[PDB]
Amino acid sequence: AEPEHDQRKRMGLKMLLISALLTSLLYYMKRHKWSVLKSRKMAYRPPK
Amino acid sequence: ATYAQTLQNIPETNVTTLDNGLRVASEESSQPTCTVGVWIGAGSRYENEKNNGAGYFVEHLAFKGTKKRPCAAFEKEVESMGAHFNGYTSREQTAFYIKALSKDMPKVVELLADVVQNCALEESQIEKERGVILQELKEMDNDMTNVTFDYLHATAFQGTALARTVEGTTENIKHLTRADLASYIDTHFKAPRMVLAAAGGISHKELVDAARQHFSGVSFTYKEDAVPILPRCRFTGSEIRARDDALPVAHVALAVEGPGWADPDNVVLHVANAIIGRYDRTFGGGKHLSSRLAALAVEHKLCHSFQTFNTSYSDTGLFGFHFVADPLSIDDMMFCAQGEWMRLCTSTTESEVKRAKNHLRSAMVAQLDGTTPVCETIGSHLLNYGRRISLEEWDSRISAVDARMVRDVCSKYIYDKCPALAAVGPIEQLLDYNRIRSGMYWI
Numbered sequence: 001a002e003p004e005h006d007q008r009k010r011m012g013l014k015m016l017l018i019s020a021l022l023t024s025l026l027y028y029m030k031r032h033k034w035s036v037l038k039s040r041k042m043a044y045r046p047p048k
Numbered sequence: 049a050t051y052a053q054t055l056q057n058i059p060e061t062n063v064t065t066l067d068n069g070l071r072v073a074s075e076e077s078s079q080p081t082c083t084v085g086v087w088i089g090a091g092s093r094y095e096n097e098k099n100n101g102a103g104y105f106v107e108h109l110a111f112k113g114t115k116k117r118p119c120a121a122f123e124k125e126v127e128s129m130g131a132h133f134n135g136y137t138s139r140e141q142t143a144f145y146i147k148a149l150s151k152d153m154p155k156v157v158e159l160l161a162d163v164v165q166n167c168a169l170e171e172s173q174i175e176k177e178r179g180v181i182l183q184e185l186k187e188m189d190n191d192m193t194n195v196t197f198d199y200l201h202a203t204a205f206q207g208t209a210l211a212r213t214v215e216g217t218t219e220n221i222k223h224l225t226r227a228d229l230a231s232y233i234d235t236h237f238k239a240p241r242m243v244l245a246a247a248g249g250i251s252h253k254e255l256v257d258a259a260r261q262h263f264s265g266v267s268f269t270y271k272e273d274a275v276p277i278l279p280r281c282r283f284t285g286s287e288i289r290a291r292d293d294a295l296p297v298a299h300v301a302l303a304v305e306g307p308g309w310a311d312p313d314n315v316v317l318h319v320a321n322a323i324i325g326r327y328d329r330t331f332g333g334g335k336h337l338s339s340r341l342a343a344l345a346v347e348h349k350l351c352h353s354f355q356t357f358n359t360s361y362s363d364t365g366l367f368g369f370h371f372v373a374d375p376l377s378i379d380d381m382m383f384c385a386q387g388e389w390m391r392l393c394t395s396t397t398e399s400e401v402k403r404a405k406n407h408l409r410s411a412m413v414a415q416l417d418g419t420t421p422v423c424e425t426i427g428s429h430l431l432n433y434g435r436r437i438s439l440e441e442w443d444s445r446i447s448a449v450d451a452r453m454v455r456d457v458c459s460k461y462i463y464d465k466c467p468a469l470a471a472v473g474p475i476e477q478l479l480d481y482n483r484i485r486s487g488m489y490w491i
Binding site: 045 | 290
């Protein structure tokens with residue numbers, strides 16, 4: 001019913017590994033750029 | 049009589065040090081008139097958080113009279129001899145100097161000495177100047193350019209002493225005590241840190257004898273002879289955006305940490321800033337101006353003006369640019385500006401540096417257009433570079449610079465660096481530190 005059965009799974013293995021490594025590296029990257037905004041401090045200094 | 053020669057002809061600057069530490073220096077000209085002053089190595093950087101604004105409050109009193117000769121006594125004596133007394137106080141350099149007839153050379157030194165040493169500090173006057181400084185702040189606050197550079201330091205050197213204004217806080221001005229101003233003077237205005245400089249029709253020897261006479265500081269312990277080393281100020285790729293859509297134009301200043309007086313690259317940095325130059329809506333040149341940025345600025349109505357700068361300091365410095373624009377062209381302008389910076393690091397041409405070097409030398413010369421400016425160079429050179437640096441030397445150094453060198457040095461200080469930003473006014477269009485950070489590379 002599905003000869004690919006074995007290869008299908010071997011791919012799944014490679015997929016998970018890359019997916020982990022990659023999702024991680026991209027979480028770091030998203031954070032990096034966004035830190036500018038995350039720690040951003042502001043204040044309302046009206047004149048007097 | 050070619051330029052080269054006129055350079056090696058300018059009389060040498062003489063320097064002699066006293067037993068107290070005071071360093072006397074001068075450049076003798078035939079000038080009937082002259083300038084002499086004491087360039088102290090003190091400023092707001094030496095002030096800490098509790099007395100930020102002392103050196104400035106003190107600046108406001110070094111002229112209201114000394115112990116010996118009170119207010120009128122001082123002014124009268126000085127006004128009546130057709131002399132001009134005046135000074136200033138930066139972040140790490142303070143100065144007091146007079147413009148008088150070469151004849152009065154020796155009486156002036158006496159006067160200078162009487163100011164740095166015996167300031168009356170009349171507690172009555174203090175309360176008056178307190179209100180004056182407070183008033184000058186209200187004013188200086190309406191000078192976008194100032195607000196913008198202070199802020200620039202405020203964030204580029206955030207957390208350090210260099211991030212303070214020279215004028216100090218509204219609180220310190222409101223509360224500083226006669227005592228505070230007192231110690232400020234005692235702690236900083238000290239011989240080994242001061243420099244009596246003069247320029248004009250003056251005998252160096254006569255100058256130094258006069259120095260010996262009133263600048264007779266005494267030094268017993270080693271402590272006194274020592275010049276303190278300031279704690280290092282940490283540069284920080286950051287930004288501070290003070291927005292007010294109500295102001296007509298917007299100011300923007302971006303910079304990277306510069307090396308510091310001592311470092312030879314500074315020469316190269318100046319040659320580079322010489323390429324990008326500066327511009328302003330009244331520069332006749334127009335569309336033909338040599339500076340691409342200027343040219344672009346003109347072709348696209350990008351800014352009411354822009355200017356590069358390399359503000360040096362002892363251990364650090366700020367290398368950047370500042371521009372004033374309309375709310376809606378801030379981005380195009382910023383874009384183009386970083387564009388040229390990236391071009392400096394990647395594709396400076398020999399033709400550019402050639403022009404740049406010439407322009408630089410010309411500015412270098414204008415730095416010595418009168419006894420006062422010349423004097424200012426001496427006081428500062430000794431204070432900063434330790435000795436005096438002749439145009440013949442500068443000129444030498446400058447000539448060594450070439451495209452390759454400009455690129456290497458600029459890459460070194462600019463390429464892929466986290467800049468310091470300060471923006472004021474209707475700055476909505478210019479935006480995102482990140483977008484600006486990426487402008488620091490490739491391109």
